[model samples]
Target: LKFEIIPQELHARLLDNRTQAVEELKQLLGKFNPSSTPHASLVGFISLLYNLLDDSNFKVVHGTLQVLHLLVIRLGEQVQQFLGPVIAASVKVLADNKLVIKQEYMKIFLKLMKEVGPQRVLSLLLENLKHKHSRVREEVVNICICSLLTYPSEDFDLPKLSFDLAPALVDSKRRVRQAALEAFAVLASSMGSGKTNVLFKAVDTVELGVMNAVQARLARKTLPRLTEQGFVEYAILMPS
Candidate 1:
């Protein structure tokens, strides 16, 4: 799959233009074979995608992630080398924006999880839960919870992850605390076992009370083990 360098004319319109311009770029980018392309060209092209993510228009950013997703598909294991910068670029976008475009970033990371392996992506996201910015911390929790619960992987150690998620239960930000509570509910139902002690050990009284209330609500409905559909239903009905 040989890919032509993005046309010079496209570069002229990359930012000033909107969805149609980005749509053209995705068409062009989808044909790229990073293995066949010059290494520097691939690097330069990735940098272009990064810029698109941070651009002001939501539609452009939305289309940009679609391009980035195509690039991830094209990169293969080579995706491993770029994960740090790719996620760093995404963290900035996530921290800066309030739009639902956050879903686009989540899709990219889910793609990375399958492409590379769970641990590599999981560790990075877990580590970022401590990021100084509340938005970053909260968003990472949402992403981490959704990805872990929704991705059908037997590789995750749900108990350990629950332990890791414990601090977010008391996060300085209200939303992060809510996200963490929802996360524990997902873990509880998905895990369906004693990690009770883990959550018990980690959360104090007030947090535990909320945890119990959330767990009781989930129990009344009796969810199946987590799946894509199950998680969607859970989130939709989940209390704020």
Candidate 2:
């Protein structure tokens, strides 16, 4: 009979009113310090949280994502079981869906990457690079950079870009290029010496030189991260 409640509980205290509440739901979840609550007690409320994802209201949808971000942040890998189903229903939206929902799904996808093994999540979003909307294409790169930053080399799947990441780095739009470059820089930091020289090729096309070898490296550098003592010899050779 433990009814210890906080003001935030109003949004979620009763399962029936999920339609009527949102910010409160966001707050209630944001406040849940799992160490303070019995995991068993959280079960019912967490179950109720899942139902909120199905809510027709976009505010409810937005709030539900915010709350889930908290849960994933709070619980970490313990929540992996929940993500399997979550990916099935939610990730499916980004695969070929509208551009409007891409940003929303990208938020949840990045949060999940912090814990859920990323290979599966990444595969769904990669093909969307061809999506007509640059925003959607841009987000796919965002998801990758977030992964490389948050997880270790062993924890996540690394894409062999030598060509795969080429498009965004050269995107017609600007933000996508920014995200792509940041992702490139971090990957450089994470990579080992000799191999880094090779990894930068993820951005490189069959071509050599970048930003015409200027500020952005518009051509993908086509070189690796390089070792401590020796430079990558980014200089192009005499002939082709």
Candidate 3:
């Protein structure tokens, strides 16, 4: 085929529907001369799907990730020039919690880390942490932890990241605060900040004129650790 059609399943359902268009499109791309020029008809097919790489439909986006990952693995620089949108899309999808979504997306994501250096990709991912989407933010925070879960925690410049994450403590959404705190807990555990110092440094960003219930709750949660870490200052000032 000089150029391929988008597929019947795509036409049969909305972009948001859990259709087989993504899977079928991927199969069809494998049949094309991916080496063909941008002038080729298949190029149009590729562009159309590229725009949908981060589609809301889990099945559609998941399959798109698989197909794009294959193209990156096979073509490398040939596909690299056109992957800015795909790379940006992955950051948003990084927060998706579904196991099915995680499986397919993560496989492609690992390939991506190899194709582009992990440090540049890591920088890209960390720059977007300031947002209101609590549930997704937790996922973002978790990914941030992935980089630090290894050695050289100092290279991450974690003190700065604490500023990005601390606002979540005072977020308007209860779930967001709760999720942020949960991720914060993981983040603190991963750090070599002498145990409870991460939480102490994070709380610095919150200008709480009065310690609210939530603040008190976080205080109660971290007080034991503060004591464990032998920060008598925190123990003395800690909430009851």
Candidate 4:
């Protein structure tokens, strides 16, 4: 099937048809395998999306991100070469002041990182870690930490990665801090060999922020309640 450039008016109308727009985008993205697209057309479409990155409406921005997310998942390896710039533009949208735009961008960013591998997306994310919005910072931290855990040691620049990620672990937002801790836990568990020392250092750093008396007391009280219900680890970790 041939693809056409969606007209501005028609695209606006599609935004109003949210569910239909998402479904159609999904289908179109799945059908147009990157291997099948001519390099010129693929480059042109990427440029089109890049230009639309600054659109004023949140719905348009959201729809664009969803389309990009689908394309990254469905045609990732084939289209991998273009992902760096595409992801850079998407990171700018994620760091936008508008909450709706940021949320949409975050969803797409997470999916891209999961599908395309964190190493490919790390620089885009690093650029946005200092975003002015707290929510954006938190979401970026959450995805960054999870991505690191999901692909540990695949990219060997651990020291640089840790340096880049250290601030998020101590971020003032509770959810960001929690997500960072959980990510470290996963990383600690997944390290394969001589990295046991690295894991211990991470746990110690994480515990510094997590081991408050109030949190400890809550865990103490909640453990037995969960253990009695056969949730051993769950009971051991829950905060009040």
All candidates' lDDT scores? 0.70, 0.55, 0.54, 0.56
Residue pairs in collision within model 4: none
Per-residue C-alpha lDDT of model 4 across residues 95-115, encoded as one tens digit per residue: 556655655565566566666
Candidate 1 regions exceeding 4 Å error are 1-4, 15-18, 95-100, 132-135, 151-154, 204-240
| Pick by TM-score: 2 or 4, better one | 4
TM-scores for every candidate against the unseen true structure? 0.77, 0.51, 0.58, 0.59
Query: Stretches of candidate 4 above 4 Å error?
Result: 1-30, 36-40, 51-53, 93-116, 148-159, 172-175, 192-196, 199-240
Per-residue lDDT of model 1, residues 43-134, tens digit only: 78778788877777788888888788788888888888889877876776677564456666766777788887765687787888879998
TM-score rank order:
1, 4, 3, 2
Displacement of residue 30 (Cα, Å) in model 2 is: 11
- Candidate 2 Cα errors over 4 Å, as ranges: 1-58, 67-107, 157-163, 204-240
Deviation from native of the Cα of residue 56 in model 2, angstroms: 10
Determine the C-alpha RMSD for candidate 4 after optimal superposition of all C-alphas.
7.2
Worst 10 residues of 1 by lDDT: 224-233
RMSD in Å for model 1: 4.1
